[PDB]
Amino acid sequence: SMADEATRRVVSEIPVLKTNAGPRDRELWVQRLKEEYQSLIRYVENNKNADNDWFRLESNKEGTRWFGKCWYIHDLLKYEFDIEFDIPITYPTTAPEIAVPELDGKTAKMYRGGKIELTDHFKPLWARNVPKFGLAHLMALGLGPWLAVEIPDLIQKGVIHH
């Protein structure tokens, strides 16, 4: 299918994750976090090599709260946005909800508190890949393409300024 090839083209060089564990799962959660960090840092290193180093992420000590920055280039100007999310208890079967709080109420494709609204195809795509996708895949397949529609639109409409 076109969808299968599009997914593989975007994620094929991102390390796949393995462990079915969420924040409550003790030593299995510690192992899941090793897969999350190994997958994120390989994605970041690929991004630098492709001149598309577009985000930084850190977590709290337990790896249950994530926060950082993404950058979006439009007409060669670089825009920075703070991003944050909580790991749901039912992770990795349930996908985290990325929030961009400074854009809260500035686009229709977003819920209260700045939680971005992905298309209906993102959720079944995550579901069919559990537990192989993690935070690197949420950034690559979720926030990435969301920015590539919403940021150009909001610059166009005079809603955000450099």
- What percentage of amino acids are in beta strands? 15-25%
Number of helices: 4
- The value of Rg in angstroms is 16 Å
Q: Could you say which structural class the secondary elements and strand pairing correspond to? A: alpha+beta
Count of beta strands: 3
Order of helices and strands: HHEEEHH
- CATH fold name: Ubiquitin Conjugating Enzyme
Distance between the termini: 39 Å
CATH level-4 homologous superfamily:
Ubiquitin Conjugating Enzyme
CATH architecture: Roll
Instruction: Using the alpha-carbon principal axes, give the shape.
Output: globular
Largest sheet: 3 strands, antiparallel
- Quick one: CATH class? Alpha Beta
Number of separate structural domains: 1
Q: Strand arrangement, largest sheet?
A: 1-2-3
Q: Note the quaternary state here.
A: monomer
Cross-link (Glycyl lysine isopeptide (Lys-Gly) (interchain with G-Cter in UFM1)): 123
Family: Belongs to the ubiquitin-conjugating enzyme family. UFC1 subfamily.
Active site: 117
Protein name: Ubiquitin-fold modifier-conjugating enzyme 1
